[PDB]
């Protein structure tokens with residue numbers, strides 16, 4: 018324990034040995050406190066706001082732009098029968114994910130090419146773009162790397178504000194060892210059967226409708242209360258078994274990431290009473306957001322297969338598994354495992370399960386004992402399922418079935434329109450020029466044109482923003498992002514919804530936006546549309562005046578009018 022984290026702690030001390038003090042009034046109970054040392058928001062996108070004036074008086078939109086007692090919790094060790102179910106399932110799942118994939122190291126080359134097209138996700142030269150073009154950094158990385166091969170760690174200590182930052186070198190070593198899970202699509206639907214990694218928001222609805230076609234009971238979508246805080250050391254150990262599929266240097270590098278950074282963590286914390294606190298713990302999730310996604314999907318897939326086992330009565334008690342209750346679990350996985358993975362859609366901590374029948378709803382003992390406690394339902398109260406795939410929540414959306422005038426079927430993503438408008442009115446960071454603010458507006462607008470075209474207010478506002486931003490300016494931003502392009506949005510729409518759509522047999526291109534349908538007017542209102550309000554009618558009618566206000570601010574540039582794409586403006 019202390020031999021694994023001592024060097025990291027003993028190092029930090031020496032750099033701040035002029036301010037080192039052990040505070041006896043430290044708030045940490047579940048975290049292990051070591052010492053302290055002296056130490057010391059969302060902006061509005063004006064292009065999007067000026068083109069969404071009716072929403073300036075909608076509190077659900079305007080409040081979105083204004084403005085750690087769970088991270089300090091302790092999970093209990095699972096029973097021996099639980100631990101046995103988890104180890105057997107995890108061993109079988111890594112083998113299945115491994116059947117058509119080859120674990121491999123990710124490279125400095127790959128890591129470099131990622132930072133040079135924006136991929137900063139909790140990091141600590143000025144920027145990471147600079148550090149990667151300087152071999153001094155890479156000598157630091159070499160020093161840490163040879164230390165890992167030696168079963169030791171020096172400079173992999175997280176920074177917590179909960180989001181866990183880590184210095185680029187440690188990030189690199191994590192990417193080198195574990196990047197392959199994301200980079201080679203271990204969690205693709207084709208490869209993992211439950212997964213949706215890389216699927217895209219235009220595919221998730223078709224995937225849920227495919228799950229719905231299976232014979233079985235209700236669709237269950239239970240959210241876990243604080244999934245990252247409920248990751249046990251037993252979970253971390255089952256995740257580590259991916260190294261059993263590796264070899265040579267790779268196996269050793271990955272083993273070190275798991276042992277030294279995941280299973281034996283150390284973290285920096287700002288406390289204003291302002292000291293920096295140095296704390297440690299073994300359990301819970303603390304990795305890069307991208308390795309966190311993949312390992313969340315894995316452990317969630319494992320947990321949901323075990324809950325399906327409990328529902329089907331493959332085992333009777335989590336307290337202890339009989340010898341013949343391991344042969345039967347193993348037989349179940351070999352016999353039906355792949356079929357049961359196909360009954361699920363899993364995106365990290367988020368899941369939809371269509372089990373064999375509704376016994377699943379009251380099968381709670383393994384799920385509770387693994388620590389995956391359901392959010393906003395009493396611990397022993399049976400789950401409430403959905404009868405209609407169009408009502409199931411998944412990845413912050415629901416999905417509509419929308420029939421085109423030509424009879425072809427679209428399955429479209431949707432959420433409350435206040436959420437969509439409120440997010441598009443927000444920018445992250447400082448130093449935004451007018452041009453950069455405009456190009457972020459255009460990214461939102463082209464997303465809305467591709468994903469949310471069926472919402473009357475979003476097609477109109479999308480058209481208005483693309484009319485107000487210079488035609489050739491490139492969309493920016495600091496699933497699959499097909500809207501991030503200067504290509505014509507009708508050509509992109511045809512590629513995504515017709516040409517490349519495996520659920521669409523007839524490949525006849527759509528020739529205008531007028532052939533692309535909306536939700537029913539009543540359904541559009543239910544999902545938050547302002548259609549029918551006086552504020553919205555005056556906005557729609559006078560839209561060219563709003564477009565002209567923004568064009569005057571940006572100045573004398575080349576613009577296109579996209580409003581004639583809509584019938585009411587085609588005049």
Ligand SMILES: O=S1(=O)CCN(Cc2ccco2)CC1
Nearest residue numbers: 141176177178182285286287
């Ligand atoms: O890593 S950072 O970009 C984000 C966190 N901040 C403050 C912080 C919290 C804990 C330790 O340090 C440092 C710079």
Ligand SMILES: [Cl-]
Nearest residue numbers: 403404405408
């Ligand atoms: Cl329902």
Ligand SMILES: [Zn+2]
Nearest residue numbers: 170171172173
């Ligand atoms: Zn290290």
Ligand SMILES: [Zn+2]
Nearest residue numbers: 415431432544
């Ligand atoms: Zn909807």
